[model samples]
Target: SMNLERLAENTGEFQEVVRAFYDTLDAARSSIRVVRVERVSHPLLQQQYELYRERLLQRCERRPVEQVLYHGTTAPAVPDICAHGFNRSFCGRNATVYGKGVYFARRASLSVQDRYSPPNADGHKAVFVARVLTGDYGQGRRGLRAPPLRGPGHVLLRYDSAVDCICQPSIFVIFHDTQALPTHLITCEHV
Candidate 1:
């Protein structure tokens, strides 16, 4: 369990998770929002996150903006991730398709329906709404523990994240743990 503070339903942060679960929400959908938005609350981790975010901004010369992203995992993994937001020690739990790092998707179909988060006892499943910081990104490849250099023979300048397409990144891979902050834990009830 984590220090999850419930976000009021009226807030856009709550609805942000709801809307991202589906492009245009259908009320009767099984993956519809079930519980009140619960934010991951830990003092030191958040402090580290703030520090790292500014580091990215200063180094990359572009502000690493936050976006609502989807994460799926088994029931027990929630506590692990909640305690430590998307650390690299647990990379490659899934495939290393993009890179051996923490992956964030755009929708539940990319996560839940794809079987990233299988159901536990009952029809309960766990999906997370994470605020991911994907700054200037580059292509991903296997064995890349971190982002590749932004240009050939460039020193002290590297991509902030990994993506397949530069224009529109459908899937994002983050090698650094501090780049991802898991915000809301959404419990999905599915058949």
Candidate 2:
């Protein structure tokens, strides 16, 4: 019943969905003002998180640059599929670890970095890539694309590890290999 072939032809409907999704994104962004970036050991982890911060700047409204120094363990969200991009159940679980220092941004502001780019630049912050950190979530996936409004985004890059789960049938769908990924990048089709 999910006819992406047919969906591709209907640019009008797809654009509408994308537009509406941004409205939801704006609300989600407004709900939170403070984001605490954790201090990780690896340079790559720090780089990926910085790139996420860059994406947030582009997608969400601007906020002050007040940094908080946290000294503890913080884990990333349990990346999962959901019926809507800002579904409380999905976002709530992700937000719970905010106290522990996970990358926090508006729902749509998040994106996976490109894996192919060299990671030695001094002022780089736009592109980020996720590498597996002891889980099957998005293992082989190279780069992350923008996510659909009602499904999963790319494997949210994590320094430690990822644990998860999905939602809905008709409105959302997830693609993966036999070995399930952490946060599978989902695509949108005009409905």
Candidate 3:
């Protein structure tokens, strides 16, 4: 049986699984990475994802960035819980749950101006965040942090992205809900 309490403490373990899962994304941004390992048999995976997201926010200039992350692995290997920080949609500004599987629900564009902006910002900041694989340049390669090596998938990152395109540095932030935010506070530069 799945131990909900003990599993909670193991949340960090699932996160380690995820970080290891997306390790494949270190190569390209548009590619899909999968984890075929057996599930952790608990809610820890969700907690791990949130914990990883928090760590990611520390490197950014803003809080509550509009984005979402999902697992493409088969059943049992994937968790059913939703990540609080990650929303599923590509809508403008506001984040919400929408679309198939789990997608980041915020405006995404290459124009930069068309992306989500803080209430009073001079322009919109990159809002769409996803894992972009840059190191796994070919088939059958190592993921960013997958475990057991052979059983794990590829790496990915949460970067401001668009259809088939992910911005450089692959890591940044976006402002959240507001009546009108300052331009300086709305934008997050790539590291």
Instruction: List ranges where model 3 is wrong by over 4 Å.
Output: 1-42, 62-66, 69-163, 166-191
The true-versus-predicted C-alpha distance at residue 70 of model 3, in Å, is 7.6
lDDT of each: 0.74, 0.24, 0.27
Q: Which pairs in model 1 have colliding backbones? A: none
Model 1 weakest lDDT span, ten residues long: 24-33
RMSD of each: 3.2, 20.1, 18.4
Q: How many steric clashes does model 2 contain?
A: 5
Poorest 10 consecutive residues of model 3 by lDDT?
A: 177-186
Candidate 2 structure, TM-score to reference: 0.19
lDDT of candidate 2 over 3-52, digit per residue (tens):
11223424675454345334533434343221111111333334554564
Off by over 4 Å in 2: 1-40, 73-191
In order of appearance, the predictions have TM-scores of: 0.81, 0.19, 0.21
lDDT of 3 by residue, 84-169 (tens): 22222222333321111122222222212223222123221322223321221111111211111222352433322222222332
Better of 1 and 3 by TM-score: 1
Worst 10 residues of 2 by lDDT: 65-74
The whole-model C-alpha lDDT of candidate 1 against the native structure comes to 0.74
